[PDB]
Design a protein around this ligand. Sequence first.
Ligand SMILES: Nc1nc2c(ncn2[C@@H]2O[C@H](COP(=O)(O)OP(=O)(O)OP(O)(O)=S)[C@@H](O)[C@H]2O)c(=O)[nH]1
Ligand SMILES: [Mg+2]
Length: 180
Amino acid sequence: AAIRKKLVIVGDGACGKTCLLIVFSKDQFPEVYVPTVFENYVADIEVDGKQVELALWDTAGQEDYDRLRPLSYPDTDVILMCFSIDSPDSLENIPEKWTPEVKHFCPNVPIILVGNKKDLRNDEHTRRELAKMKQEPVKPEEGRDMANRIGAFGYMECSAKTKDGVREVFEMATRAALQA
Ligand SMILES: Nc1nc2c(ncn2[C@@H]2O[C@H](COP(=O)(O)OP(=O)(O)OP(O)(O)=S)[C@@H](O)[C@H]2O)c(=O)[nH]1
Ligand SMILES: [Mg+2]
């Protein structure tokens, strides 16, 4: 074959990590049952004339999987640090939980900053439940501003629900890994 790379995905609860993996691998969105950790799919993908076997590692942090997470880190080639466009609190934790942590187990490892649930930017229900507690949905600017802060390979937005922008997340993830 060719190039075999290991991608680990981390982020706050319900920011869409497991869903995202699935849309990318199974090629449609899981509405019925979403597991807590999607098992270990290795997915074929062709990026920049290279054939890659991308191995997807899901994580969690509530609760069992707090303890088990750091075990999925070791041999990582690319990280998907995620947050959700509809939760600015999840963004807050990018520089305060997830970067310091990643950089501890996997320094020198390329990070993609991903904001999921893109579809919920202009969802009216969403805009209102947020304004209640004096918040609005994350802007694309402040996501890219944050990717630059943490020293990320790039920034990508996607909605696994609408399937939009998902492939792009994993090309940028694969490129980031291919970069040796
Ligand atoms: N609108 C919208 N909702 C989403 C999207 N992805 C996930 N969700 C919703 O948010 C909830 C959390 O999904 P999930 O993917 O399991 O979060 P997670 O942080 O990855 O949780 P885990 O399985 O790794 S432990 C689900 O109920 C799902 O309906 C998305 O792209 N758009
Ligand atoms: Mg979680």
